[PDB]
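Our platform keeps sequence and structure together, in a single record for each protein. Such a record has a labelled line for the sequence and another for the backbone structure tokens. Nothing more is needed to write down the fold, since each code stands for a local backbone conformation. For reference, a complete record is included directly beneath this paragraph:
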Amino acid sequence: GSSGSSGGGLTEICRKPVSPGCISSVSDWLISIGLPMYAGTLSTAGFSTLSQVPSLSHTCLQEAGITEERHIRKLLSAARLFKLPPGPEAMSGPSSG
């Protein structure tokens, strides 16, 4: 579910309930860490999927524009702590894992 819209235009009062606490996309994760100031930063670099989040890198952030060794460390650390849920556990390839 994309759940969104194209451009501006608010129809009637939105009034939305507080987040469920669970992360859905990068942003949601960036906010849960207190670094939502990068949401648009990484998103612009291509970071749209939460798959690249847990795969960040000192160079990855540096490419986006992030230099603050204080923020980069937090992001890289927060990403490594991002434990994604398992799937159908079976498919993978020729080599078992």
In short: The radius of gyration is 16 Å. The first helix runs from residue 26 to 33. The CA atoms of residues 11 and 77 lie 39 Å apart.
